[PDB]
Amino acid sequence: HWGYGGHNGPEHWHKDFPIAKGERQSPVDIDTHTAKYDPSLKPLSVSYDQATSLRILNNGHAFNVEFDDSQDKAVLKGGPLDGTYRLIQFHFHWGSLDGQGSEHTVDKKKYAAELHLVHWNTKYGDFGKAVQQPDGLAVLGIFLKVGSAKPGLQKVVDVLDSIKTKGKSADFTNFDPRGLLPESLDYWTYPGSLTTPPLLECVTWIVLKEPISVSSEQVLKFRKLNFNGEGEPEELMVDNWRPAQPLKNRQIKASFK
Numbered sequence: 001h002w003g004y005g006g007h008n009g010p011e012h013w014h015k016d017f018p019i020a021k022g023e024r025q026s027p028v029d030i031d032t033h034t035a036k037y038d039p040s041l042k043p044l045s046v047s048y049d050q051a052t053s054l055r056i057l058n059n060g061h062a063f064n065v066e067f068d069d070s071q072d073k074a075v076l077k078g079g080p081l082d083g084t085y086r087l088i089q090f091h092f093h094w095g096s097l098d099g100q101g102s103e104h105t106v107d108k109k110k111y112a113a114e115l116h117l118v119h120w121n122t123k124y125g126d127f128g129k130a131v132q133q134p135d136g137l138a139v140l141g142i143f144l145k146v147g148s149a150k151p152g153l154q155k156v157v158d159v160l161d162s163i164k165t166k167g168k169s170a171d172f173t174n175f176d177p178r179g180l181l182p183e184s185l186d187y188w189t190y191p192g193s194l195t196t197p198p199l200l201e202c203v204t205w206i207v208l209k210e211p212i213s214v215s216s217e218q219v220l221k222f223r224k225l226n227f228n229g230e231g232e233p234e235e236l237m238v239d240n241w242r243p244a245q246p247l248k249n250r251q252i253k254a255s256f257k
């Protein structure tokens with residue numbers, strides 16, 4: 001099965017998932033000199049006041065914080081988007097060292113990690129239908145750099161010891177994802193894909209310009225997770241990022257001047 005190891009990593013995925021070589025793959029490098037301001041783009045509307053987190057799960061490739069998405073509670077609207085997108089889960093990608101870990105890059109700079117807040121377009125009724133549509137998902141991507149601690153991340157870090165291995169989950173209620181958002185909502189946007197198999201070309205990417213700061217101790221705890229299941233040979237969950245893919249016939253638009 002696919003992964004990030006020595007023999008099943010991103011360069012192998014195309015054998016089982018040929019869309020890996022498609023026209024709309026993610027992530028990409030964001031060339032800040034070529035992305036053009038688009039005065040038609042609106043401010044993002046992030047409405048997380050009513051978010052209901054439920055559970056945290058180590059799925060063998062990352063950990064997902066899952067939300068109740070059975071009604072419009074936490075939603076993303078505005079920006080480049082038409083209609084309403086409901087938050088279903090967030091997760092991160094991160095490195096073995098601070099100098100790598102993000103999926104998107106900015107002028108080729110890799111950040112220590114990247115947070116993905118995943119939302120689906122409610123006009124398609126359920127998530128599984130949305131991933132089959134070119135405008136099915138909106139993923140809000142936020143870079144992490146190592147510096148001061150992020151207070152709103154600590155609840156996540158402290159539960160990680162309880163979900164060390166693949167297939168473990170823990171209850172995770174009452175977590176407020178607003179504590180993971182930088183000050184500014186300036187962004188870049190482009191049409192792309194899921195960055196893990198099945199690599200479906202169903203995502204409107206919204207990547208915030210301003211990174212959040214997390215401490216070295218916080219990220220170190222991410223790196224103590226395991227890709228493997230309980231009892232199996234230990235493989236630290238690090239470097240679970242796909243590198244940048246060809247931009248092809250796409251334009252990256254900026255929300256800011």
Ligand SMILES: CCCNC(=O)c1ccc(S(N)(=O)=O)cc1
Pocket residue numbers: 152176177178179180
């Ligand atoms: C404290 C739990 C995690 N939440 C936050 O950090 C947070 C929430 C709302 C706003 S506000 N209302 O200023 O846009 C700012 C911060």
Ligand SMILES: CCCNC(=O)c1ccc(S(N)(=O)=O)cc1
Pocket residue numbers: 116118131139193194195196197198
């Ligand atoms: C469809 C099979 C389950 N996969 C997902 O739901 C999914 C995959 C990648 C991303 S990402 N890393 O592009 O935010 C978000 C969601």
Ligand SMILES: [Zn+2]
Pocket residue numbers: 091092093116195
């Ligand atoms: Zn992701």
